[PDB]
Amino acid sequence: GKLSEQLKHCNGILKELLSKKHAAYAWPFYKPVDASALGVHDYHDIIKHPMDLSTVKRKMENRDYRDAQEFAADVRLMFSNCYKYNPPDHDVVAMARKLQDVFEFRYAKMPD
Ligand SMILES: COC(=O)[C@H](C)[C@@H]1N=C(c2ccc(Cl)cc2)c2cc(OC)ccc2-n2c(C)nnc21
Ligand SMILES: C[C@H](O)COC[C@H](C)O
Ligand SMILES: [Cl-]
């Protein structure tokens, strides 16, 4: 059925994270990490709970998230996985920080 007001805001955020204006740093987060394709054969030994924006989108459409907090925990898990696997100076980490800045500042504008 209809998303709660808070989940509508979350959906708006998700749409923004997937939009062209953020694509320069958001693109690595669009789909699940393909460890074999990228040659990172230790990725799934290190990252026990993969997450990505396509998965968040599917969960939103399927009404998997019961509240905004559950949604935010998944988006933050996605960034945390990036910070866990990669050295802090790597390009993909800089991209994560930038997308997380976009995310956290709009999430903070959550309606009430
Ligand atoms: C060798 O290290 C890697 O390839 C990372 C595992 C990988 N880097 C990258 C990565 C590496 C360099 C740049 Cl400039 C951007 C992303 C990556 C690439 C993608 O291509 C579709 C998908 C996901 C990632 N990603 C995410 C998210 N978190 N870590 C990565
Ligand atoms: C860069 C840190 O990992 C996340 O910072 C969030 C802040 C709102 O930019
Ligand atoms: Cl959280």
- Domains of the chain are 1-112 (1.20.920.10)
Q: What is the DSSP string of 17-53?
A: HTSGGGHHHHGGGSS---HHHHT-TTHHHH-SS---H
Distance, in Å, from the CA atom of 49 to the CA atom of 46, rounded to the nearest integer, reads 9
**Rg of the Cα atoms in the chain:** 14
Distance, in Å, from the CA atom of 106 to the CA atom of 97, rounded to the nearest integer, reads 14
Pocket of ligand 2 (CB under 6 A): 97, 100-101, 104
Q: Which of 100, 102, 106, 109 to mutate to test the pocket of ligand 2 (most atoms within 8 A of CB)?
A: 100
Ligand 1 contact, 33 CB (< 6 A) = yes
- 3-state SS, one letter per residue, for 45-102: HHCCCCCCHHHHHHHHHCCCCCCHHHHHHHHHHHHHHHHHHCCCCCHHHHHHHHHHHH
Which value in Å is the resolution of this experimental model?
Answer: 1.7
> Cα dihedral angle (13, 19, 24, 29), rounded to 10 degrees?
60
* CA of 75 relative to ligand 3 center, distance in Å: 8
Distance, in Å, from the CA atom of 103 to the CA atom of 99, rounded to the nearest integer, reads 6
Residue type present at position 82: C
Residue 63 in tokens:
């009404």
